[PDB]
Amino acid sequence: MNRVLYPGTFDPITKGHGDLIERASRLFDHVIIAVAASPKKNPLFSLEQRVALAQEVTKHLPNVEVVGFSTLLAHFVKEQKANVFLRGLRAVSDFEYEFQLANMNRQLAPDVESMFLTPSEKYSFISSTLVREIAALGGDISKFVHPAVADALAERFK
Amino acid sequence: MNRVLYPGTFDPITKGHGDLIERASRLFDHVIIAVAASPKKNPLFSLEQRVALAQEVTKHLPNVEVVGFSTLLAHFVKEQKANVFLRGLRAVSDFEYEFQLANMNRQLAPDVESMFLTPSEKYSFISSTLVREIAALGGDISKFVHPAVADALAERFK
Amino acid sequence: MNRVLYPGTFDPITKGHGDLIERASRLFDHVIIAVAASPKKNPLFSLEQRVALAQEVTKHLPNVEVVGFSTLLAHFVKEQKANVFLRGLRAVSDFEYEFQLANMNRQLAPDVESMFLTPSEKYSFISSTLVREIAALGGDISKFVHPAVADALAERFK
Amino acid sequence: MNRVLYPGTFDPITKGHGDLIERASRLFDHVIIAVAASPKKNPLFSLEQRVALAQEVTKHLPNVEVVGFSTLLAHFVKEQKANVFLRGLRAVSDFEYEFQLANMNRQLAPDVESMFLTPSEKYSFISSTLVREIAALGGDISKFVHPAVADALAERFK
Amino acid sequence: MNRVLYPGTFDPITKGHGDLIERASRLFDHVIIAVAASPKKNPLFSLEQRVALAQEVTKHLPNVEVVGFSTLLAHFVKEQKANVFLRGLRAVSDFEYEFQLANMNRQLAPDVESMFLTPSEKYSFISSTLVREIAALGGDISKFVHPAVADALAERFK
Amino acid sequence: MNRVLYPGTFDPITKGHGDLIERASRLFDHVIIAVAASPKKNPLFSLEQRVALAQEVTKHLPNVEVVGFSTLLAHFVKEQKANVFLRGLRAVSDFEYEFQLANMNRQLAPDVESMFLTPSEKYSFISSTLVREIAALGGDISKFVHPAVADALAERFK
């Protein structure tokens, strides 16, 4: 079978990410949401809290587990025994940066293939960075993230 | 009537912004230059001086108003009773970020329309970030910005 | 006043065009849909039927007029006394062609301003070319175009 | 089950396609190379000959089948009972057409998921159109296509 | 010394192309304007007439010669004993197609390096295709091409 | 004369840069690798150490000199009496920043021409930022950078 690994910051996890997991859960027999620590980017939520948010959003999917890791992505995919990388591609991404990451990871872990999916047309154009800025200014983010994610973001700025 | 709101950092305001304001004043009955504080990017000039610079550059246009705001753009455009967003289109810039911002602003303020303009070929490829870097190294920036902006930047790095 | 001219082939007119006309009617006092003949690309529908389709789709909007023209766009916009060009912005499309066309039109008609709009996320990624190809193979195109356009395309390939 | 369908013109099939089929064969239990007729593009090789070329290039893979079709891709994928669309992304593809095709196919066949793969850096930047132009001028195309394709192209233009 | 080869259709040659030749003539000791026949694209002007136009535009440059060729570009650069390919890069080009051409030509002629230049900001966004369409509709093309090129285009449509 | 100036951060220098310097050495009589200080980017290696790394990678080329500078690029190129700017384009670069930098540098130093080269397909998609992130996590970066750079990065994060 195929065990897909979905790595990302997930700070926070949005409906664009969630729609990708919904499509990935129907496709693969096992989906691993690999929440990366990434302490150099200064995430708003901690690695511990980001894992709990991704679990609440994906608690309805049986073959989906969320794990936090602070090691190299190329080494962690071997430790998780996953053979497929998963990244999202919408009309608002990093087409340049996404190819360098997929190509350089193919040199570190040639057994792991990097495939890309596209979210729904309604949940594209939704970035986690703009979600935090709107949440920091008291904006309504019910359209971009799960209701549980909106609770953490609302509580984070009080 | 049409009351357009042109939001941005304007740190500093350049001839690309000025040409965009010149075209916006000819089209709409009232142009509001909404200078955002944006403390997370560490602006070179303060919000007060960026408003004063945009007023000096646009003092010859009667239907142009400059205001500084530090709140959410979706809330501030409603308080100004503006129904049109204005954003600039050059080379490629962040074609992704411009689409995600316009779409996410359409979810917070669906009544406010996001339109885009393109400056003249003479004032394209002029970014506010590169103006500060050349000014920090003592370079001649009289060609890229208004004479008043060149004075403030010269006073900033001497 | 503001009299916007929306030029294009409209072969056929899609929901992406329709959403753009809906937003243009709310903003400007008069919208002119300038349907171009464009015989070099070999359009599927004639200029007469493309005008009739755009009139049927926009018959509910009072400030919208549909006209067919086979002359230069720069000459026709002057004859219609329009001062604003209107073009659509989706995914990426021909970001190059849109800039060269807007700039070269600014050399032929500098008094006519070229502004760009973006349709809703629901009607983006909808091209007139792919609508004809799916219609030619008997596909269901009720989701992409107006019901009247689906009738003409169905009559075209049966 | 996972039965992937790889549609394309394959006129002719190149080493960029071949590396994509080899990576798709490692992931899925069955790979279907769906060679489209596309008579409107005026293909260099016929639909029958394009299928025979793709069979020779992929004759070493047991779980790979090549079929030719001249109907709608959404109807043919339903007839093949395939649940995965496959398209290639080499950072020099048609991100515009690829996103419009995947999204509009999601309206015709929502049960079929559109995923994208990336070939190796050595086999990227290889387009079937430029292979025909170099072959038409007597150029050496042994590096871009399979040896069997090089024989057909050499026989085609000599 | 360096003998640069500037290949292209030049149908017709524009001021964007001319500005590239002006910069190339100051840089290299010898500039060869290689006008390609390209009969499959159906050029407006013949290969014989396109050579005469490029000679009239560049008659003021001593180290610039215009030649017409109907063979492979990779073979013709060896026959011309040129070691540098030259292509233009503006904010309106074919960033995808330009890399495939430069990379695949590096496999056919590894001794010939493909370098890229950028024209002036005023002469960017000027394509030969839009020049012919505007000329075919009686438009004023004095801004895009040399006065001699405007004479041929005006005489061509009478 | 032709004295090319190759500016960049080189933090660290990669194989994509190295292939670009080897191709630049074949063309010009003298290649100057201008390592910029750039203290605002917080480089991993110091300006002195980045110059020493570029010297070891290019020690086999006689006509290549590496110098460090902390002034404006337009002022330093005048002090070096160089007439050619050199930047790399691998279809995954920063076409936005690269065009804005080349055009605005043409206002500061019009006598200095900005040309672009493309590295091999094997050494494209290699960014200095991703090399540091993989090295910081103990990853194998022997394939992306020179062996001397691999020793420094291994000593830097071990």
From Swiss-Prot, chains A, B, C, D, E, F:
Subcellular location(s) of the protein: Cytoplasm
The entry's keywords: ATP-binding, Coenzyme A biosynthesis, Cytoplasm, Magnesium, Nucleotide-binding, Nucleotidyltransferase, Transferase
GO biological process, one term: coenzyme A biosynthetic process
InterPro entries recorded: Citrate_lyase_ligase_C, Cyt_trans-like, PPAT, Rossmann-like_a/b/a_fold
Cofactor: Mg(2+)
Site residues, Transition state stabilizer: 17
MF-aspect GO terms: [citrate (pro-3S)-lyase] ligase activity; ATP binding; pantetheine-phosphate adenylyltransferase activity
UniProt record similarity statement: Belongs to the bacterial CoaD family.
Subunit structure: Homohexamer.
UniProt function note: Reversibly transfers an adenylyl group from ATP to 4'-phosphopantetheine, yielding dephospho-CoA (dPCoA) and pyrophosphate.
Name this protein carries in UniProt: Phosphopantetheine adenylyltransferase
Organism: Pseudomonas aeruginosa (strain ATCC 15692 / DSM 22644 / CIP 104116 / JCM 14847 / LMG 12228 / 1C / PRS 101 / PAO1)
Gene name in the database record: coaD
